[PDB]
């Protein structure tokens, strides 16, 4: 079973450097080549670079002098330094795998989930979970709606999980905006009224930038 | 150093109606082996990007027949018919014939469906957090169409806009609806001196406003 994983620093300082490694499984880098794609915030896919299965690297013109795809065939890792960082260097850094024949890949086969990179002054401010439970005054019908307002984190991104993932039933995520120099997002999940407060609901927030995670349990009032 | 143009930048369309994306290259995307390396990729919201079409007209596994990719040299088109909510996401063309390989600027597929009314719920600030100098009354409005809505916070009669922040969603991939979150945060202080709180909200669905207020009693 093939997997591609990426690790990173969440944030980094303006004008400094950054490397992101791509941990891989199910295949080999001797036999295969992996590209580096990225996605500026609110922008479109941006080819960063390539490393053919034979140590050879071809790069993105607009930054090859800031790029440098390395690899460790034995370690199945795909590192990627990147000197003199800048503020529009902010993107998601995916490691995709080659599906075409030999030296011309038919398409980027399997993509990692993506490591996020934020370039700014500000430092890692951890998040603050607060549950969004309904008052006692109002009531609901057949189904209920709850969530968590996860406030005050930096940098992006976070990731909530409802009822240990056994929830997926009407789960909405609302993007995070900045405020006081800090991000603030919220998650809502709708569940049958026969289940809440009936059964034990809970919201679990991941945020690798500070790595910390808080799972909240919901009680009215 | 090869250019690829993608138009339109966004494409409204309805479930069951056909779609077409023409990708334009500034030059030849044909290889010396006569094989022109043009891919289409889709990125649903939240999800990672995915290969759909891998050689102009060659569908990739999973991807159903409703997706079509035609093209010669400058002109390539992705046509997707019998359009689902799942079709949502950004579609990108990618050329791999000569280096450096490049992407189109993507086109946002837009679906037009049946008007759906919004579901509002107001949630009063949290115990713990209230004990944190702060007080936030976060409302919710879920599963609506069109994306056009209006929401205001009253605090004993008047309206609140000061610093207020609402957050929307991209159209759902299952019901193709939008949702939005508004927060009304201030200080405990001020929360400590207003009793009831209203989550007003108007929409194309209801001639009457959608309200979700709550007292501090």
Full DSSP string of A46-96: EEEEEE-TTS-EEE-GGGTTT--B--BGGGTB--B---S--TT--EEEEEE
Running DSSP on this structure, what letter comes out for residue A134?
-
Among candidate residues A122, A148, A176, the one where a domain is terminated: A122
Could you tell me how many CB contacts below 8 A there are between chain A and chain B? 140
Same domain, B121 and B189: yes
The whole-angstrom distance between residue B177's C-alpha and the CA centroid of its chain comes to 9
Among candidate residues A122, A141, A156, the one where a domain is terminated: A122
Same domain, A32 and A106: yes
The answer to whether residue B179 neighbours chain A at the CB level (below 8 Å) is yes
Among candidate residues B53, B84, B113, the one where a domain is terminated: B113
Q: Which residues touch A75 (CB under 8 Å, ≥6 apart)?
A: none
Among candidate residues A122, A152, A178, the one where a domain is terminated: A122
**Tokens 């993007």 correspond to what residue?**
A175
Rounded CA-CA distance B115/A135 in Å is: 29
Same domain, A175 and A128: yes
Q: What is the helix, strand, coil percentage profile of chain A, to 5?
A: 5, 45, 50
Same domain, B16 and B93: yes
Same domain, A220 and A111: no
Same domain, B100 and B120: no
Among candidate residues B80, B113, B146, the one where a domain is terminated: B113
Q: How far is B16 from chain A (nearest CA, A)?
A: 24
* CB-CB neighbours of B123 under 10 Å: 28
Domain membership of residue B19 as a residue range:
1-113
Cβ <8 Å between A100 and B140:
no
For A106-137, b/e burial (b = at least 16 CB within 10 A) is bbbbbbbebbbbbbeeeebbebbbbbbbbbee
Structure tokens at A69: 């795809």
Structure tokens at A95: 């490691």
Query: Is the CB of residue A124 less than 8 Å from the CB of residue A209?
Result: yes
Domain membership of residue A97 as a residue range:
1-122
- Most A CBs within 10 Å: which of B37, B107, B126, as the mutation test of the A interface? B126
Cβ <8 Å between B142 and A190:
yes
Output the domain CATH number for residue A103: 2.60.40.10
* Overall domain count for chain A: 2
Same domain, B2 and B81: yes
Helix (H/G/I), strand (E/B), else coil: B98: coil
Q: How far is B23 from chain A (nearest CA, A)?
A: 15
* Overall domain count for chain B: 2
Helix (H/G/I), strand (E/B), else coil: B161: coil
Q: How far is B61 from chain A (nearest CA, A)?
A: 10
Among candidate residues B67, B90, B113, the one where a domain is terminated: B113
Same domain, B4 and B31: yes
Chain A positions in Cβ-Cβ contact with residue B136 (cut-off 8 Å): 130, 149, 151
Rounded CA-CA distance A138/A159 in Å is: 29
Chain B positions in Cβ-Cβ contact with residue A146 (cut-off 8 Å): 123
Pairing mode, strands B10-14 and B107-112? parallel
> Which residues share a beta bridge with A47?
A37
Same domain, B121 and B107: no
The answer to whether residue A143 neighbours chain B at the CB level (below 8 Å) is no
Chain A positions in Cβ-Cβ contact with residue B138 (cut-off 8 Å): 132, 147, 149, 186
Q: How far is A62 from chain B (nearest CA, A)?
A: 9
End-to-end CA distance of chain B: 66
Cβ <8 Å between A173 and B169:
yes
Helices in B93-208 by DSSP H: which ranges? Answer: 127-130, 188-191
DSSP codes of every residue in B122-149: EEPPPHHHHTTTEEEEEEEEEEEBSS-E
Query: Is the CB of residue A215 less than 8 Å from the CB of residue A204?
Result: yes
**Tokens 């349990």 correspond to what residue?**
A217
B106 closest CB neighbour out of A44, A104, A114: A44
For B93, the closest chain A residue by CA position comes to A45
Cβ <8 Å between B51 and A100:
no
Cα distances (angstroms) measured from residue A101 to each of A107, B35, B37? 10, 12, 12
Same domain, A211 and A128: yes
Output the domain CATH number for residue B153: 2.60.40.10
Cβ <8 Å between B94 and A172:
no
Experimental method: X-ray
Same domain, A106 and A168: no
Binding site residue list of B: 156, 194
Chain B positions in Cβ-Cβ contact with residue A111 (cut-off 8 Å): 48-50
Is the peptide bond prior to A140 cis by the omega test (within 30 degrees of 0)?
no
Cβ <8 Å between A46 and B103:
yes
Same domain, A110 and A11: yes
Q: Which residues touch A1 (CB under 8 Å, ≥6 apart)?
A: A25, A26
Q: How far is B214 from chain A (nearest CA, A)?
A: 7
Interface of A with B in 101-120 (CB under 8 A): 104-109, 111-114
Q: What is the helix, strand, coil percentage profile of chain B, to 5?
A: 5, 45, 50
Which of B146, B205, B156 shows the shortest CA–CA distance to B180?
B146
Which of A171, A168, A132 shows the shortest CA–CA distance to A150?
A132
Query: Is the CB of residue A120 less than 8 Å from the CB of residue A87?
Result: yes
Same domain, B1 and B93: yes
Interface of B with A in 74-93 (CB under 8 A): 90, 92
Q: How far is A2 from chain B (nearest CA, A)?
A: 15
Which of B210, B205, B201 shows the shortest CA–CA distance to B177?
B205
Same domain, A174 and A93: no
Same domain, A88 and A169: no
């Amino acid at each position: 079973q093939v997997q591609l994983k990426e690790s990173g620093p969440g944030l980094v300082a303006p004008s400094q450097s950054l490397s992101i490694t791509c941990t891989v499984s199910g295949f080999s880098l001797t036999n295969y080549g992996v590209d580096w794609v990225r996605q500026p915030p609110g922008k479109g896919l941006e080819w960063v670079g390539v490393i053919w299965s034979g140590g050879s690297t071809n790069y993105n013109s607009a930054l090859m002098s800031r790029l440098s795809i390395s690899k460790d065939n034995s370690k199945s890792q795909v590192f990627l330094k990147m000197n003199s960082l800048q503020t529009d260097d902010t993107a998601v850094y995916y490691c995709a795998k080659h599906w075409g024949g030999y030296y011309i890949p038919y398409g980027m086969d399997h993509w990692g989930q993506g490591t996020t990179v934020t370039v700014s002054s500000a430092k890692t401010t951890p998040p603050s979970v607060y549950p969004l439970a309904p008052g006692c005054g109002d009531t609901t019908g057949s189904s209920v709606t709850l969530g968590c307002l996860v406030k005050g984190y930096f940098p992006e991104p976070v990731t909530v999980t409802w009822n240990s993932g056994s929830l997926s039933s009407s789960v909405h995520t609302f993007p995070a905006l900045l405020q006081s120099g800090l991000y603030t997002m919220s998650s809502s999940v709708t569940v049958p009224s026969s289940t809440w407060p009936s059964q034990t609901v809970t919201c679990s927030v991941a945020h690798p930038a500070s790595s910390t995670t808080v799972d909240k349990k919901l009680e009215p009032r | 150093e090869l250019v690829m143009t993608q138009t339109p930048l966004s494409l409204p369309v309805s479930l069951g109606d056909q779609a077409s994306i023409s990708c334009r290259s500034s030059q030849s995307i044909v290889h010396s082996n006569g094989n022109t390396y043009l891919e289409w990729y889709l990125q649903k919201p939240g999800q990672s990007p995915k290969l759909l079409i891998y050689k102009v007209s060659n569908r990739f596994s999973g991807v159903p027949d409703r997706f079509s990719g035609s093209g010669s040299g400058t002109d390539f088109t992705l046509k997707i018919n019998r359009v689902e909510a799942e079709d949502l996401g950004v579609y990108y063309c990618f050329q791999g014939s000569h280096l450096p390989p490049t992407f189109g600027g993507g086109t946002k597929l837009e679906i037009k469906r049946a008007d759906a009314a919004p579901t509002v719920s107001i949630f009063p600030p949290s115990s713990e957090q209230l004990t944190s100098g702060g007080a936030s009354v976060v409302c919710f409005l879920n599963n609506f169409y069109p994306k056009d809505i209006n929401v205001k916070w009253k605090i004993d009669g008047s309206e609140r806009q000061n610093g207020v922040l609402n957050s929307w969603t991209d159209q759902d991939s299952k019901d193709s609806t939008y949702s939005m979150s508004s927060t009304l945060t201030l200080t405990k202080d001020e929360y400590e001196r207003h009793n009831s709180y209203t989550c007003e909200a108007t929409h194309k669905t209801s001639t009457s406003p959608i309200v979700k207020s709550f007292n501090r009693n």
